[PDB]
Every structure is written in structure tokens, then in C-alpha cells.
């Protein structure tokens, strides 16, 4: 039921590297609790995903929802060539701007029950994708803009 | 209950100021489970305290389970030391997240909420003083290792 508080632009908790979750938190009410949170506030919000630092957790987990899917410990395994530029505004940056990404990501994570997934997005999951595993690595979008 | 990873030395998450847990939170499954995860982690660490950011988490959450005399854990939303003593004591401290010798005030007032929400206010003596000014470090962004003065 719980919107967490986001941090904006200016705290230091969305410039860090993410720890990533561990084996003990897959399929526990922990971790379903975060996720649940998470997917609350990314919902109040208007958003098409989010990332955990942004509601203070130091914890590689995202949400991408352009079905909401939740990512535990991504990796983006190879990026296209073939870029493609579009419109980001970001719930942490109250300025949205252009911004170049790859067209197609392939991509490994686990699911909330720990069972390993891999597959591609194209387009603009592709973009939700790299925007958020970026929050996980302490890059906001306009880093990737001047 | 789950045993969660702990930050050490050297990682940044430590270094920050936590934020304060929103009111939206008090009460909350979210917030139970938060401090039940601490709660397991501290235990199984043989820790007498913890806070929030040493399990990656930067919000204003501790707890004090001293055993050193025996207490029965407390957990502390958003805890604010309203009073320090003038009187001082000096004893070997150690960290989930690292040991040596730290002053610390020898009692603390403390205002903090409960997991519900609700205020309460303590005065803490001794080693569990020294206990909440440890874990209040920590949701300041500060090491033990800063104090070997
Ligand atoms: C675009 C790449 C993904 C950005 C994700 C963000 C949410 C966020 O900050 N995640 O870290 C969002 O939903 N942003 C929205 C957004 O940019 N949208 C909403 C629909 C179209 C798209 C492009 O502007 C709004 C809320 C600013
Ligand atoms: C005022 C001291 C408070 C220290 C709290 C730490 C745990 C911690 O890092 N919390 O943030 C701890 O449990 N340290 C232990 C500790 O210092 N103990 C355990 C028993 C008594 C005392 C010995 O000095 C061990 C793990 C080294
Ligand atoms: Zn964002
Ligand atoms: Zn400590």
C-alpha cells in the first residue's frame, strides 16, 4: 500500500553503485514488500519504471512497465549499435530532455523467486531498461546529455 | 526472517545522511518487514545494535539490544537525541560495517517513534547509550573509527 519518499537531483544516495540483493531476500516477504512499494510509488507517480535508490534503497532492483516486470540484479549483456534518441523526464529530476539509446539491450536478471531470466527489449523498454540500470550505477539522464 | 548483506568500511552508503521515514510508512508491512530483516541480520551477526544504512537502506531506522548489561531490543523510527550528559564514559567499541576506544556521553534523552507511529521518550545510561550513539552516527554518516580521539 506504502508510496515511499524519492530523492531528487542533489542527493548523494542516487550518485552511488547499488549493492546487489543477495540469495537469502529472493522469495521472501522482504523483498515482495519492496517491490510492492516500489510499484506503488512508480504508480503514483505516472511512471513507466523506477529504480530503487530513488526511494533511498541501495539495492540493484528495478521495475520497467511500459505488464509492470520486476528486475533483481540486471545486467545488460550486449547493446545494440543502432541508437535511437527519445524524450526522457526522470521522478528524480523535477527538466526532461533527448537522450540517445541503444535500440535493442539484451538483458539478464532474476525474478522475485530467484529464477534466472535473459531476454531482449527493443524501443522504449529498451530505454526504461537502460535509464534505470543507469540509477543503479549513480547516473541520472542528463549525464548522458551535453 | 531473512539475514541481509552489510555494508564495511569504504562503501559510500555509510557516508550519508539517512532520510527521515515518511509518514505514509509508520505502520506499514514495508516497515515491519524492514526491521525484522535488521532484526535477524543484527542477531545473526552478534551485533547489540544496527542501523538501517549498514543493510543498504538510507532511512532514520535503529535498533538497541544491549547483550554489557541485558535489555529487550528496542526499534526507533526516526530517533533524536534531545540531551547529551556533560558526564563522559570511554570503552572499546567495534562495528558490523569495520576497533578501539570512543567518549561517549554517558546518558542520552531520546525521542524516537515506535514502528506504529507512536512517541516515545527514553533516557538511556551506560553501554546502551553508547549503543543508540553509535547507531544515530550511522544515520549521520559516521564511522566509530572518525571518534578514536
Ligand atoms: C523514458 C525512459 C524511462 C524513464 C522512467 C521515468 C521513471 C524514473 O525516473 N525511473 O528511474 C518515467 O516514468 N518518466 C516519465 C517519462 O519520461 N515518460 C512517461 C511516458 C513517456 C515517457 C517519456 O517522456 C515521466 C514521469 C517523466
Ligand atoms: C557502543 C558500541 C556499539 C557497537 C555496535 C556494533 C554493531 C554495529 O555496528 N551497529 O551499528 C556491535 O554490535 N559491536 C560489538 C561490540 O562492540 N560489543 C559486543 C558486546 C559488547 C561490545 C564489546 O565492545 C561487536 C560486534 C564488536
Ligand atoms: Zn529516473
Ligand atoms: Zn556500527
Same mark, same amino acid.
Given at each position: 500500500?506504502?508510496?515511499?519518499?524519492?530523492?531528487?537531483?542533489?542527493?548523494? *544516495?542516487? @550518485?552511488?553503485?547499488?549493492?546487489?540483493?543477495?540469495? $537469502?531476500? &529472493? $522469495?521472501?516477504?522482504? &523483498? %515482495?514488500?519492496?517491490?510492492?512499494?516500489?510499484?506503488?510509488?512508480?504508480?503514483? =507517480? $505516472?511512471?513507466?519504471?523506477?529504480?530503487?535508490?530513488? /526511494? %533511498?534503497?541501495? @539495492? =540493484? /532492483?528495478? *521495475?520497467?512497465?511500459?505488464?509492470?516486470?520486476?528486475?533483481? $540484479?540486471?545486467? *545488460?549483456? +550486449?547493446?545494440?549499435? #543502432?541508437?535511437?534518441?527519445? #524524450?526522457?523526464?526522470?521522478?528524480?529530476?523535477? #527538466?526532461?530532455?533527448? /537522450? +540517445?539509446?541503444?535500440?535493442?539491450? @539484451? !538483458? @539478464? %536478471? &532474476?525474478?522475485?523467486?530467484?529464477?534466472? !531470466? +535473459?531476454? /531482449?527489449?527493443?524501443?522504449?523498454?529498451?530505454?526504461?531498461?537502460?535509464? #534505470?540500470?543507469?540509477? &543503479?550505477?549513480? *547516473?541520472?539522464? !542528463?549525464?548522458?546529455?551535453?
Amino acid at each position: 500500500s506504502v508510496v515511499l519518499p524519492v530523492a531528487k537531483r542533489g542527493e548523494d *544516495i542516487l @550518485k552511488l553503485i547499488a549493492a546487489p540483493v543477495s540469495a $537469502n531476500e &529472493l $522469495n521472501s516477504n522482504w &523483498l %515482495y514488500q519492496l517491490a510492492d512499494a516500489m510499484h506503488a510509488t512508480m504508480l503514483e =507517480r $505516472n511512471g513507466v519504471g523506477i529504480a530503487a535508490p530513488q /526511494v %533511498y534503497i541501495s @539495492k =540493484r /532492483v528495478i *521495475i520497467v512497465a511500459s505488464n509492470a516486470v520486476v528486475m533483481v $540484479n540486471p545486467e *545488460i549483456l +550486449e547493446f545494440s549499435s #543502432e541508437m535511437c534518441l527519445g #524524450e526522457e523526464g526522470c521522478l528524480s529530476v523535477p #527538466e526532461r530532455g533527448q /537522450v +540517445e539509446r541503444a535500440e535493442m539491450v @539484451k !538483458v @539478464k %536478471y &532474476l525474478t522475485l523467486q530467484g529464477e534466472m !531470466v +535473459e531476454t /531482449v527489449f527493443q524501443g522504449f523498454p529498451a530505454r526504461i531498461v537502460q535509464h #534505470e540500470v543507469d540509477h &543503479l550505477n549513480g *547516473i541520472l539522464f !542528463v549525464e548522458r546529455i551535453s
